[PDB]
Amino acid sequence: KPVWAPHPTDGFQVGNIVDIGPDSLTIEPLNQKGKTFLALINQVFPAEEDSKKDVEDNCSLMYLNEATLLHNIKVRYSKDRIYTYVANILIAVNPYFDIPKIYSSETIKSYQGKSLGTMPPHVFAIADKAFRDMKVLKLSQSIIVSGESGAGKTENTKFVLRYLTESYGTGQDIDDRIVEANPLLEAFGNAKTVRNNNSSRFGKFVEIHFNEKSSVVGGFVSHYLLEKSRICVQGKEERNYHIFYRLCAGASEDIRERLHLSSPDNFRYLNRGCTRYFANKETDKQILQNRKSPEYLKAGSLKDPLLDDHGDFIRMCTAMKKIGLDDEEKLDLFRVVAGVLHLGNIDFEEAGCNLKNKSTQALEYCAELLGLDQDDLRVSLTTRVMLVIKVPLKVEQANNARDALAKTVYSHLFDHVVNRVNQCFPFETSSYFIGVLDIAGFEYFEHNSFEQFCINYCNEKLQQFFNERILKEEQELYQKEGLGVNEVHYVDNQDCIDLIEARLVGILDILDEENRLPQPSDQHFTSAVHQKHKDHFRLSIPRKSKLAIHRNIRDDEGFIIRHFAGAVCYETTQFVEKNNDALHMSLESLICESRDKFIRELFESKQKAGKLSFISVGNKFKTQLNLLLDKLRSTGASFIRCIKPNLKMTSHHFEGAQILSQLQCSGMVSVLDLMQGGFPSRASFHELYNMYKKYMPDKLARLDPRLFCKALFKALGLNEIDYKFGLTKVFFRPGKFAEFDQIMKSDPDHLAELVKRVNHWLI
Ligand SMILES: Nc1ncnc2c1ncn2[C@@H]1O[C@H](COP(=O)(O)OP(=O)(O)O)[C@@H](O)[C@H]1O
Ligand code: BEF
């Protein structure tokens, strides 16, 4: 009798059907009771008989649907079971606290060489299946860890890497380096955002390479889209990259004086954001008074279970030593970091413009740390080279020259760090790899800019990949075998991908075209997108938004993209500026020709006077992404769907509607609809024949694999609908292969008797 009917905060609630109607159902919520509400036919789902129980694999449910999945993972989460399967897919709900011993060395050991279902659901089982499939099928593998900001992608990527190196490594401390390199990338590429204290402001693909003997030979890290806007200004509850705070909180008084550092409130590149440190009662005592901002003294420390700006600086130094990064290179990194900070403190005033007299120290400190002549820096920030004529810049143009230099220097430093990490675990050759993808998922905010557009473009391509691998190939296998399964259709998003990335006509090339025009304009670009794609299904003017908050945005000030997971309204202001990775020739020449070898080497691995300096961020990213998707399409794939349980970073706080929405946007409803009608467990006639012939009377082996299976299945008295004979394999319905392997373990005399009852000639 019980069903699942909608609920605004829980997603679903338990109810009973009291009246069925042509277009809606009448639900009486459980133990209310006189209260009744109307729900759509397609929003009411059958519920499990036992509401207390849970299944490790959602395919084991009596009814597999979004409401039964949501309940199952809710019950598990309340019992600190954050991992649940959906056939070969893993659902990982962020616990927001440390679940004891569940990632221990003993735990790693217990998951080694064990098939899915042998052990409880775990990120370690997904990693082991990847290593085992790689070893047996002699084909590279990829693990895609997806989810919203704060979902746990980065933490689960670490668990995968740590499991694989600690389980299939050589034993020597060289295996630790793939793990020990993460605090280093996180110091430079992670930052405090409102949705995640340790947010990754870059995407990564971490490959672990192996030989023919399937043993780690090294690794390789591909980094994507480091956020540049974060380097100069942040919102008041957000911070710059972790390194800035780890250095101000942890650097010795010797490093502090040498790099001319102080409390974060003294730097423009930090003081618009949150200037507080992550500390506890113990670590606050370790931070000197000259490091603490007035905001920190007034409001105290920021709280997090793991981040500690003082302790993280110590762990980062340890990580640097452990991966082979000497003290000289350590200080070189810090020098460039402080060089960016001091650059930010340079102020300009109307003359044409010039440096403020109060900016004298900042110019001095920045030029010394970046290896530049002060006058060269002063001239390169307040003028500009045109067709040759030094045109004086206005105060706002100087601010932009300053910040563009900062963003370039920091982005190049991050490339150095990524590449340095890759040199610390190199390999001559490899047979296969296990790649782990950790990149930002689809998201919308009140304001979406070029950064979100790029992330959402990337997600459009990864969703297409997931849809093909999980829905398209699986249904093609059912049709090829002639199983006559109900077709589950998904919306093909190729037209959305094309809209963004096609050459000449795509939005990324229309943006590039704008950057190459004599007077580039965000509005001219936006009108060109709307004019070219006026009749496109995936594009709209902001006026046509379903959300009232976007209706005032002019046609030339934005656009809507109907992404796979939903419509996103973009404000196109600063799209032209954000699409350009290049510096004006004067600034590029200035920094490439630094006195300091390390700074020059940041730009090692020529523009004419009146020539345009332009490097397309969009098309550099399209290229990197097309390479990544060549790698992913070449490999076997596994999917880890991470779920953010709430908007408060709190433990044991399951927000049903928010979770349902994440499962819905990731396309899991189509997966459940496919599974509920599909056959996830399968085996060839020869595979079943070779594995189970020994258990049966001898005469059964004389039969060909197909007919051996036909005879066995008749002897066992298996439900005709529980399995389906295909052209080359037996397809087992959700959780019906387990029932078969169960009886096959039964007494051989009873198996012989079962055969005798259906064909005594086979005795
Ligand atoms: N399994 C886990 N165990 C403990 N804490 C976790 C776990 N997964 C995530 N967290 C917590 O949630 C935070 C956000 O997770 P994170 O991996 O950074 O998210 P994402 O990379 O998806 O943005 C982490 O900093 C940590 O506090
Ligand atoms: F905060 Be997530 F790593 F994008």
Question: Is 157 close to ligand 1, i.e. is its CB under 6 Å away?
Answer: no
Residue 302 DSSP class: B
What's the gap between Cα 407 and its chain centre? 23
In a 3-state reduction of DSSP, which class is residue 385? strand
Binding-site residue numbers for Mg(2+) are: 154, 200, 438
Experimental technique used?
X-ray
Residue 240's nearest CA partner among 229, 254, 255 is: 229
Rounded to whole angstroms, the Cα distance separating 530 from 560 reads: 10
- Give the 3-state secondary structure percentages of the chain, helix then strand then coil, rounded to 5: 45, 15, 35
Rounded to whole angstroms, the Cα distance separating 46 from 49 reads: 9
Which one-letter amino acid corresponds to residue 758?
A: V
Which residue's CA is minimally distant from atom 26 of ligand 1? Answer: 96
Q: Tokens for 737?
A: 């292969």
Q: What are phi and psi of 428, to 5 degrees?
A: -65, -60
List, as one string, the DSSP characters of 168-229. Answer: HS-SSTTTHHHHHTHHHHHHHHEE--SS-TTEESSEEEEEEEE-TT--EEEEEEEEE---SG
Q: Tokens for 334?
A: 């810090």
Residue 712's nearest CA partner among 687, 735, 675, 679 is: 687
Q: What are residue 580's DSSP bridge partners?
A: 616
Task: Lay out the sheet containing 723-725: strands in order across.
Answer: 681-684, 729-732, 723-725
Residue 247's nearest CA partner among 298, 316, 182 is: 316
Q: Residue 191 Cα, ligand 2 centroid: separation in angstroms? A: 9
- The CB density around residue 288, as the number of other CB atoms within 10 Å, is 11
How deeply is 435 buried, as exposed, middle or buried, from its count of CB atoms within 10 A (0-12, 13-18, 19+)?
buried
Question: Is 29 close to ligand 1, i.e. is its CB under 6 Å away?
Answer: no
Rounded to whole angstroms, the Cα distance separating 241 from 227 reads: 10
Whether omega before 358 lies within 30 degrees of 0, making that bond cis, reads no
List, as one string, the DSSP characters of 571-603. Answer: E-TTHHHHTB-PPPHHHHHHHHT-S-HHHHHHT
Q: What are phi and psi of 449, to 5 degrees?
A: -120, -165
- The CB density around residue 269, as the number of other CB atoms within 10 Å, is 24
Q: Tokens for 511?
A: 């943006």
Task: Lay out the sheet containing 539-540: strands in order across.
Answer: 539-540, 558-563, 566-571
Question: In testing the pocket of ligand 1, which one of 198, 200, 648 has its CB within 8 Å of the most ligand atoms?
Answer: 198
Question: Is 152 close to ligand 1, i.e. is its CB under 6 Å away?
Answer: yes
Question: Is 154 close to ligand 2, i.e. is its CB under 6 Å away?
Answer: yes
Q: Is the dihedral of CA 695, 696, 702, 707 positive or negative?
A: negative
Q: Tokens for 565?
A: 């997971």
Question: Is 200 close to ligand 2, i.e. is its CB under 6 Å away?
Answer: yes
Q: Tokens for 418?
A: 């990524």
Rounded to whole angstroms, the Cα distance separating 222 from 416 reads: 12
Q: What is the CA radius of gyration of the chain?
A: 30
**Three-state SS string across 333-374, please?**
HHHHHHHHHHHCCCCEEECCEEECHHHHHHHHHHHHHHCCCH
Rounded to whole angstroms, the Cα distance separating 385 from 608 reads: 10
Question: Is 306 close to ligand 1, i.e. is its CB under 6 Å away?
Answer: yes
In a 3-state reduction of DSSP, which class is residue 293? coil
In a 3-state reduction of DSSP, which class is residue 751? helix
Q: Residue 281 Cα, ligand 1 centroid: separation in angstroms? A: 23
Q: Tokens for 676?
A: 């509920």
Rounded to whole angstroms, the Cα distance separating 337 from 359 reads: 18
Atom of ligand 2 minimally distant from the CA of 441: 4
Which one-letter amino acid corresponds to residue 183?
A: P
Per-residue exposure over 705-726, b if at least 16 CB sit within 10 Å of its own CB, e if not: bbebbebbbebbebeeeebbbb
Q: Which residue has the tokens 């920045």?
A: 366
- The CB density around residue 354, as the number of other CB atoms within 10 Å, is 16
- The CB density around residue 756, as the number of other CB atoms within 10 Å, is 14
The continuous run of DSSP H or E covering 540 comes out as: strand 539-540
Question: Is 678 close to ligand 1, i.e. is its CB under 6 Å away?
Answer: no
Rounded to whole angstroms, the Cα distance separating 426 from 24 reads: 62
In a 3-state reduction of DSSP, which class is residue 536? coil
Rounded to whole angstroms, the Cα distance separating 404 from 434 reads: 37
Which one-letter amino acid corresponds to residue 510?
A: I
Domains of the chain: 1-46 (2.30.30.360), 47-238+425-444+636-678 (3.40.850.10), 239-323 (no CATH), 324-424+584-607 (1.20.120.720), 445-583+608-635 (1.20.58.530), 679-763 (no CATH)
Rounded to whole angstroms, the Cα distance separating 591 from 340 reads: 12
In a 3-state reduction of DSSP, which class is residue 752? helix
CB 758 within 8 A of CB 715: yes
Which residue's CA is minimally distant from atom 11 of ligand 1? Answer: 96
CB 327 within 8 A of CB 317: no
Which residue's CA is minimally distant from atom 2 of ligand 2? Answer: 149
Task: Lay out the sheet containing 11-20: strands in order across.
Answer: 37-40, 24-29, 11-20, 2-7, 45-46
Which one-letter amino acid corresponds to residue 107?
A: T
Q: Residue 94 Cα, ligand 2 centroid: separation in angstroms? A: 13
Residue 738's nearest CA partner among 127, 90, 46, 56 is: 56
Q: Which residue has the tokens 């598990």?
A: 76
Rounded to whole angstroms, the Cα distance separating 457 from 15 reads: 40
Question: Is 149 close to ligand 1, i.e. is its CB under 6 Å away?
Answer: yes
Question: Is 146 close to ligand 2, i.e. is its CB under 6 Å away?
Answer: no
Question: Is 150 close to ligand 1, i.e. is its CB under 6 Å away?
Answer: yes
CB 67 within 8 A of CB 47: yes
CB 274 within 8 A of CB 238: yes
Q: Tokens for 177?
A: 């380096």
List, as one string, the DSSP characters of 436-463. Answer: EEE-PPP---SSB-HHHHHHHHHHHHHH
Q: Tokens for 226?
A: 């480091």
Residue 114 DSSP class: -
Per-residue exposure over 396-419, b if at least 16 CB sit within 10 Å of its own CB, e if not: ebbbebbbbbbbbbbbbbbebbbe
Residue 733 DSSP class: P
Which one-letter amino acid corresponds to residue 74?
A: K
Q: How far apart are the first and last CA of the chain?
A: 48
Which residue's CA is minimally distant from atom 14 of ligand 1? Answer: 150
Chain breaks in the chain (C to N over 2.5 A) after: 351, 387, 605
Q: Is the dihedral of CA 355, 359, 361, 363 positive or negative?
A: negative
Rounded to whole angstroms, the Cα distance separating 465 from 631 reads: 12
Which residue's CA is minimally distant from atom 27 of ligand 1? Answer: 96
Nearest listed ligand to the Cα of residue 640: 1
Q: Which residue has the tokens 């659902």?
A: 91
Rounded to whole angstroms, the Cα distance separating 382 from 633 reads: 49
Binding-site residue numbers for ATP are: 147-154
Residues listed for the chain: 763
Question: In testing the pocket of ligand 1, which one of 96, 107, 197 has its CB within 8 Å of the most ligand atoms?
Answer: 96
Rounded to whole angstroms, the Cα distance separating 247 from 270 reads: 13
Q: Which residue has the tokens 């059958």?
A: 46
Atom of ligand 2 minimally distant from the CA of 193: 1
How deeply is 757 buried, as exposed, middle or buried, from its count of CB atoms within 10 A (0-12, 13-18, 19+)?
exposed
The catalytic residues are 149-150, 154, 196, 199-200, 441, 443
Atom of ligand 1 minimally distant from the CA of 145: 22
Which residue's CA is minimally distant from atom 1 of ligand 2? Answer: 199
The continuous run of DSSP H or E covering 2 comes out as: strand 2-7
This PDB structure is determined at a resolution in Å of: 2.2
How deeply is 350 buried, as exposed, middle or buried, from its count of CB atoms within 10 A (0-12, 13-18, 19+)?
exposed
Q: Which residue has the tokens 């995968």?
A: 160
Per-residue exposure over 131-144, b if at least 16 CB sit within 10 Å of its own CB, e if not: bbbbeeeeebbbbb
List, as one string, the DSSP characters of 668-707. Answer: HHHHHHHHHHS--EEEEHHHHHHHHGGGS-GGGTTS-HHH
How deeply is 87 buried, as exposed, middle or buried, from its count of CB atoms within 10 A (0-12, 13-18, 19+)?
buried
Question: Is 196 close to ligand 1, i.e. is its CB under 6 Å away?
Answer: yes
Q: Residue 309 Cα, ligand 2 centroid: separation in angstroms? A: 18
Question: Is 196 close to ligand 2, i.e. is its CB under 6 Å away?
Answer: yes
Rounded to whole angstroms, the Cα distance separating 154 from 177 reads: 17
Rounded to whole angstroms, the Cα distance separating 198 from 149 reads: 10
Contacts of 434 (CB under 8 A, 6+ apart): 127, 130, 131, 134, 140, 141, 142, 143, 164, 207, 208, 210
Binding-site residue numbers for ADP are: 94, 98, 103, 150-155, 196
Q: Tokens for 739?
A: 């029932």
Q: Residue 146 Cα, ligand 2 centroid: separation in angstroms? A: 10
Residue 575's nearest CA partner among 535, 627, 521, 615 is: 521
Question: In testing the pocket of ligand 1, which one of 81, 93, 155 has its CB within 8 Å of the most ligand atoms?
Answer: 155
Residue 365's nearest CA partner among 258, 266, 270 is: 258
Phi-psi category of residue 300: left, alpha or beta, with phi > 0 → left and psi -120 to 50 → alpha: left
Rounded to whole angstroms, the Cα distance separating 485 from 677 reads: 6
Rounded to whole angstroms, the Cα distance separating 153 from 165 reads: 18
Question: In testing the pocket of ligand 2, which one of 149, 204, 454 has its CB within 8 Å of the most ligand atoms?
Answer: 149
Q: Residue 149 Cα, ligand 2 centroid: separation in angstroms? A: 4
Q: Is the dihedral of CA 655, 657, 661, 663 positive or negative?
A: positive
Rounded to whole angstroms, the Cα distance separating 335 from 592 reads: 16
Q: Is the dihedral of CA 718, 722, 727, 729 positive or negative?
A: negative
CB 150 within 8 A of CB 114: no
Q: Tokens for 496?
A: 């959305």
- The CB density around residue 583, as the number of other CB atoms within 10 Å, is 23
Q: Which residue has the tokens 């954001």?
A: 273
Q: Tokens for 239?
A: 């911070």
Q: Is the dihedral of CA 749, 751, 752, 756 positive or negative?
A: positive
